[PDB]
Amino acid sequence: MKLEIFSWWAGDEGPALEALIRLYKQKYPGVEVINATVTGGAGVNARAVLKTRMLGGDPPDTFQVHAGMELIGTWVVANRMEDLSALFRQEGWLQAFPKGLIDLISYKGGIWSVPVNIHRSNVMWYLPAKLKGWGVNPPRTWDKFLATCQTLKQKGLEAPLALGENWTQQHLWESVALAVLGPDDWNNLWNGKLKFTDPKAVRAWEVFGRVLDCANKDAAGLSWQQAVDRVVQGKAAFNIMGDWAAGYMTTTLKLKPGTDFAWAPSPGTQGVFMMLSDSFGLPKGAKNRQNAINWLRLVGSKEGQDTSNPLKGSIAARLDSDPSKYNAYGQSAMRDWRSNRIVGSLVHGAVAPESFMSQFGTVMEIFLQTRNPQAAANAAQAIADQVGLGRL
Ligand SMILES: OC[C@H]1O[C@H](O)[C@H](O)[C@@H](O)[C@@H]1O
Numbered sequence: 001m002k003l004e005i006f007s008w009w010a011g012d013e014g015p016a017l018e019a020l021i022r023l024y025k026q027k028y029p030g031v032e033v034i035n036a037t038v039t040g041g042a043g044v045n046a047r048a049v050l051k052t053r054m055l056g057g058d059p060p061d062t063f064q065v066h067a068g069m070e071l072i073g074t075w076v077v078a079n080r081m082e083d084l085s086a087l088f089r090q091e092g093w094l095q096a097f098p099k100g101l102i103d104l105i106s107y108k109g110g111i112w113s114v115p116v117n118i119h120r121s122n123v124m125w126y127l128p129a130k131l132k133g134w135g136v137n138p139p140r141t142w143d144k145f146l147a148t149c150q151t152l153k154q155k156g157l158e159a160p161l162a163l164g165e166n167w168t169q170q171h172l173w174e175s176v177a178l179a180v181l182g183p184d185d186w187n188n189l190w191n192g193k194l195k196f197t198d199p200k201a202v203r204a205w206e207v208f209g210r211v212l213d214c215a216n217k218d219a220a221g222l223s224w225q226q227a228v229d230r231v232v233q234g235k236a237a238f239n240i241m242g243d244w245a246a247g248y249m250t251t252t253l254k255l256k257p258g259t260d261f262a263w264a265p266s267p268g269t270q271g272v273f274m275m276l277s278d279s280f281g282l283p284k285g286a287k288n289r290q291n292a293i294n295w296l297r298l299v300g301s302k303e304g305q306d307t308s309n310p311l312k313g314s315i316a317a318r319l320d321s322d323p324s325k326y327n328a329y330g331q332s333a334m335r336d337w338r339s340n341r342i343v344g345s346l347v348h349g350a351v352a353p354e355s356f357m358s359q360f361g362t363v364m365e366i367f368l369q370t371r372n373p374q375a376a377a378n379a380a381q382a383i384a385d386q387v388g389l390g391r392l
Contacts, residue, residue, distance in 0.1 A: 001030040003291040005280075006053075007064035008046040012225060012252045013244065016312035023307060024298055031291050036060055041224045042167045042347065047354065054080060059283035061292040066349025067104040067115055069279035073353030073392050075283070076112050082282040083110035087293065093300055096318050100342060104350060105279060114280035115317035116299045116320040117309050120333055121274040121345040122175045122266035123246075125239045126233055128259070134237065138264050142179055142207050145267045147237070149214040152237055159216035162236035164227035166361050169212075170347045172240045173364065176211060179268025183343045188352040190344075192390030196380035205373035212368075213362035232261070240266050241391075242276070242348065246329040247313025257328040265336075274342040276348035277317060303324070314326075355387040 009017040014037070021033050038046040043064065050063055054075060065071050068354040070371075075081050088094055088111050094102065097115060106115050126138055134155055139145035143246075152160040163169060178186050180203050181194070188194035194201060216222075216230065228245050230236040232253065239245070246263065249255045266270070280299050286292050305316040306325045315321065315333050323331050344350025349357065363383065367376040 001028075001032065001291065002034060002061075002288050003031050003295060004034040004036050004060045004288070005062055005295065006036045006038070006046070006050060006060035007174040008038055008040055008043045009064070012248060015251050016247065016308040016314075019311055020298065020304055020308045023304060027298070028291070028294060031054050031288075040291070041165065042078045042171075044167055047358070054078075054283070055064075057285070059285050060296055061286045061288045062280045062282060065111060065113055065279055065281060067101065067279045068350035069353045069392060070349025071105065071113055071279065071281070072107045072359065073355065075281075076107055076110075077392070080284055081112050082284055083112070084114065084282060084296070085109075087114075087296065089366060091297060091300055096300070096320065098317075098319060100366075101277060101317055104277065104344070110201055113281035114296045114300045115277045115279045117278050117303060117312065117314035117347065118317050118337060119242045119276050119278070119314045121171065121242050121276060121348060122178060122272065123241065123243050124264050124266050125228065125245055125249075126237055126262055126264075127231060127234065127243060128262040130234050131237065133234075136237070138262070139238075139267050140264070140270060142176065142211065142267045146210055146214070149237070153214075154207050157237060159214065159230075159235070160225040160237040161211065161214040161216070162230035162239040163212075163215035163219040163221035164224050166364055167347060168222075168224050168227060169219070169368070170239065171242070172205070172211065172359055173208050174274065174346050175240050175266035175269060177201075177210045178272060178274055178343065180204045180207050183272050183341050186343050187351075190346075190389070192384070196384060198379050201375050201380075202377040203333055205367060205376045207210065209213060209367070209371055209373060212371075243313045243329065244331060245313065246333075247311060248311070250327060250329070251311045263329060263332070271340055272343060273336050274343050274345050275337075276350050278314070352389065353387065353392060354361040356383060359383045359387075 038049045068101050136148050139148045149160040185194050231239045302318050309316050310326050346352050363379045
């Protein structure tokens with residue numbers, strides 16, 4: 001009796017998953033659970049290893065996968081995933097999750113994964129005590145951000161923005177783009193109505209370039225946790241990162257939300273929640289099909305999601321989640337989830353296929369070397385053209 005769970009929740013990202021695994025082992029003491037993590041922020045490495053396994057005919061029993069185009073445009077269109085519609089009916093999930101989320105996991109009459117959470121991409125983290133020590137406010141626009149960072153450089157803070165490795169630069173970029181375009185034109189990139197070479201979209205890269213000039217010069221070789229650490233250490237003022245950062249700061253670092261650190265929407269994005277969702281499906285050919293199905297039932301449940309997510313920093317996908325189980329960050333994100341305009345993340349798989357996502361890092365590499373907005377814009381457009389962005 002075995003169950004192999006594939007994810008990128010390694011190291012200090014593992015607490016929430018480990019909690020779910022203990023829960024599963026209580027309910028199913030016969031099953032030896034293989035925690036098959038591929039170490040690497042945002043699943044860049046996991047994606048590559050999964051590809052080797054899936055194409056090799058050796059699927060895991062289930063794998064972490066983002067709801068939306070990431071899920072659909074890779075293993076679903078390849079006809080390698082089981083349709084979960086029957087299970088959704090059995091569990092009452094169609095009424096348990098918001099319709100917008102159901103839509104992301106639905107394609108050609110089937111439902112293809114089970115959401116465990118909602119993360120938000122567009123969060124700016126800072127230490128409200130360090131900001132007072134520097135006598136600045138948390139910036140609500142990119143102009144105020146750029147002006148505040150200049151003040152901080154003047155006051156001796158060399159790199160007021162914390163930044164890490166390539167994907168985290170893309171992560172920053174999607175917040176900047178959302179701010180510059182607004183939610184509708186952000187959405188228009190992904191349906192192909194707005195070209196990346198439109199002056200409106202080129203400007204995303206202009207604003208992004210200036211933001212990049214407030215960042216640490218050693219960013220390329222740092223993990224997302226190391227970039228958060230810079231803020232906690234006061235070697236930076238700000239970091240734009242998903243709310244797994246809140247999980248890191250509370251679960252791992254034992255910091256108190258609101259007093260030891262605070263949060264705001266990414267500058268220029270207040271009122272918009274850029275979402276993503278970690279989900280699990282059922283691969284065809286899974287060696288342990290029933291055990292995996294039982295894992296899906298747990299991750300789709302209120303008991304599972306309200307055990308795991310408070311540790312993670314994400315909120316539950318389930319509408320019936322109990323807010324009393326969440327700290328001050330969790331409860332804030334819960335509120336914004338219900339009230340804000342919702343758009344999806346690029347970097348975390350909601351809005352574009354892996355064909356595009358995987359090549360966006362190359363685009364970002366070339367912006368880092370050229371710092372030419374038009375070149376980057378042109379590169380994103382060529383990629384979109386080559387993959388047929390919008391066809392799914
Ligand atoms: O690795 C950092 C984060 O990246 C991913 O995009 C996941 O959706 C999230 O679960 C994870 O914490």
